[PDB]
């Protein structure tokens, strides 16, 4: 245990002194979950779940949305109200501070040291109570999140299967709804403490400025509803923008997958044009969003100026000509800031409260939704026509029981009913932890060994037996990681047969009596199914005398079982055995590049405008200082001039930040796209897709959403802090020399913070990722988990995960409180010293009263500007560190005028090729020649070098040696664009990117309609194309199920037809295609290609047999042969015929 909050001295419970040791150790050694503590018994999943379920029980025994609400209320009780009362007392003392400022200012102009030390004490106490309030509220919220999370997970166990969309709604119910609830519980005490704050503020300012005060008290208040309105607009804009963004991502996911396909003919620019077309729409939305952001930032600092303007001008020169002592004006200034700070929070509080109300309504709607069988009766509804009718079945021990029938006869339904999964209406069923593999296979977010063990102690002989008996070890070794390979989400990097074999292995490996397998032979061949039923079923299951109940439909399994079960229309037609059935019927460089992408045009326009705005904001008060003592009319007019300058300059600065941020986002995205386009193929193959896709998915989005606002806030905070320091220095010179020590202290407080605040931050992210994912895994494979009776262990795992999340999200708020309190203590020390120097120096000797006003008013508030500064600095640093990876990604004609000849005669003399710079060579002394108009075949085993030969023919490998030519022409003087408008290629991996048929046939779109129609008619595709809406305009999706595999290859051949390269490369147009269709495909491609030399590569016999010139790829080299009928009998059918 390390997080000891409840077990320390009640002084440190306030000032967080126990964090000194943690943060000092954290500076040196990197924090981790082993270096972190464990949550106390006072706050776990179990404790909060216990209190919440006790309250829910006491409320439901007296029987809903209001019910769950009151249950949470009575369950979390005293802590929340304690935080709220801390908060209101702090608010009172904060409203009290400026009045003692006023008293001091009065006394010196006409008992003040006492007021100064009282101000010091009241500041420190008020801020301490505020911080304790924040922390207690945050901890209550974290408790509530853990509690309702484990509660809705407990509910996930008892729900019914009849209720895809529900899974997404469940995981949003944990990712956004629960966060809304918890953040609303953060802001709950603020909603109680805001009204008393504004009421005390208005009544206090009225008694200081009189009737005029009221007028001012209106203006500031009028900003609070307006703000809300602005916020709403933002939200609307956000929605629209998000939509566009999503679409863009889709149009990217294709390009970053058909990489080799894309670059094999250089259609990449054609798709980049479309990608840029989407980007402009996205940019257009962003303008309005940033305009609203600018309006918000503008009002933020405009209302403070406007209040003082329309109040002071409307007080003296309007109403009663009352002499305005410096105390009145400066107290009004202080109260204006102390009231502006809370006003913004009310809008966000209202939004958070309504959103939390909706989310709790949603949570309530969700949260409240032998083997003997005699008289089976049930259905998939609380009321409806039944599908289970009159089923009586006995499943004795040690007996193979097949279930056979037609499609839709209640086979798997009977399986789940035997499981107890479906509580039958009227019937009896008796038989426990039963192993079960469902029809649709499911996996976890873990390794292969883990999925097959499934929380079971590992075995050597047992596990190796199960691995070998499932025909799974070779394909397991085929994976990039021989074992312990991280199986992707749902098994994207695996095939269906592998998932099925893993599921069957999981079912077989578990030690239990009963095993169900819902058709485990649907995605398996004949050989693998035979070996599985022989070794794993009849030899391994039948070994330990288990009760195997397998449902399938084959021939070999019928005489191997004991009981045959025939189902028809949900009824057992006949029953018995076989015989009874047959006898019956971050450095400054990242920011430097970020701002230099904007250019010199806007950098200075931003910086100098900010400097001038802050200079105006200080000069207005500097002139007010001389205004005070008493040409009052001229004074007020100068005040009005300054007030106007301030607001105009603020609007200018905001518009500048907006425009600059948008331009930078534009240029950065375009440069990233362009630099990713020109990368080599081996680079794309080396780097995983997640990192390349992820930068565009988030980095871009993150920057656009948060960099401009956070940068603006950081700049405003730092300049306001520097201005306040300069003010309190100019007021009292000696005070300056006292403030530089303390500020240096802050430097030491800075380092130790960041080197931990960053760390904890990332830890939070990590504990958020496997938690949510875990949830999803439980939802899909719910039947398997309720069948294995493994609910207890999984609930244990989820309590573990939510504890690991809460400890991180708790240490983070503890560290934020630490930095806050210490920076605030120093911000109170500085105002203490400033007032103590001002009372003596500026009164006893200097005798100038306009000074102390400015100094006190700025030192009463310097601390909040300091805190804004430091927090925004931390955020800007993490965001700039996120940006740096974008730059890391950023750093990755004599024969032309003569038309490319149709003579396909080529010759590659002494060719070699390597993949990486200075690695093992792929080819060795490759010499070959190809005659015009002659079909060429190439053979070889896997890894022989035929794909490498094709890629080198398209010079896709960047370490080839020798000279390679086409009609005396090579790659020494031609750019890539000409090199891709000269040859055609059909890859083994076909794809149909989204769009219309015109976008797939000719994405360039140069070709005319009759040309595409003829290409479809020749490619045996015109009839199915005419059977679609519109014709040549069917909206296709990436991959999908809109066309057959043969039709995808027909589209590839149509691409080849329209390419008109006159040279064709056929890279395994045979794999994963039915022979009945592949043979007619090759016949069409032969009858269509009488000219325009084609070089093919495959592992089929007849394809290699039909080619004229063929070269057998040896271990490292090739051996070519010209006449096909001569080399297939010269070696006496040893190396070229039986191999083919
Ligand atoms: C902006 O301040 C305020 C100023 C005045 C008032 Cl009347 C209220 C607040 C205020 O904020 N309302 C209290 C509720 C609240 C929410 C966030 C913060 S916080 O400081 O930003 N964040 C943390 O402490 N920890 C986070 C919490 C989320 C998980 C990760 C760690 C502090 C407090
Ligand atoms: N989880 C479910 N929720 C609601 N209805 C279901 C569910 N599973 C199946 N059904 C319905 O129950 C009917 C019968 O389903 P099955 O028992 O799976 O068909 P079966 O032919 O006996 O076995 P199969 O096809 O190998 S899974 C279908 O028409 C479905 O609409």
Author numbering: 215 to 277, 283 to 329, 354 to 406, 411 to 616, 678 to 739, 768 to 921, 996 to 1040, 1060 to 1321, ...
Pull verbatim passages from the article behind this deposition:
Specifically, they are inhibited by ATP and activated by Mg-ADP. Previous studies have established that the functional KATP channel is a hetero-octamer composed of four inward-rectifying potassium channel 6 (Kir6) subunits and four sulfonylurea receptor (SUR) regulatory subunits. KATP channels in pancreatic islets are composed of Kir6.2 channel subunits and SUR1 regulatory subunits.
During cryo-EM data processing, 3D classification demonstrated continuous conformational heterogeneity of SUR1 in the ATP + GBM state. Specifically, four peripheral SUR1 subunits wobble around the central Kir6.2 channel in small angles. This greatly limited the resolution of the overall cryo-EM density map and deteriorated local map quality of the peripheral SUR1 ABC transporter module. Further improvement of SUR1 map quality at the ATP + GBM state benefited from focused refinement with local search on symmetry-expanded and signal-subtracted particles of the SUR1 ABC-transporter module. The map of “the isolated” SUR1 ABC-transporter module reached a resolution of 4.4 Å and demonstrated markedly enhanced quality, especially for NBDs. Instead, a previously unmodeled density inside the SUR1 central cavity in the ATP + GBM state map has a distinct elongated shape that matches the GBM molecule in an extended conformation. In contrast, this density is not present in the ATP state, where GBM was not supplied into the sample. This unambiguously demonstrates that the extra density inside SUR1 central cavity in the map of the ATP + GBM state represents the GBM molecule. More interestingly, we observed extra density on the degenerate site of SUR1 NBD1. The shape and size of this density matched that of ATPγS. Therefore, we modeled this density as an ATPγS molecule.
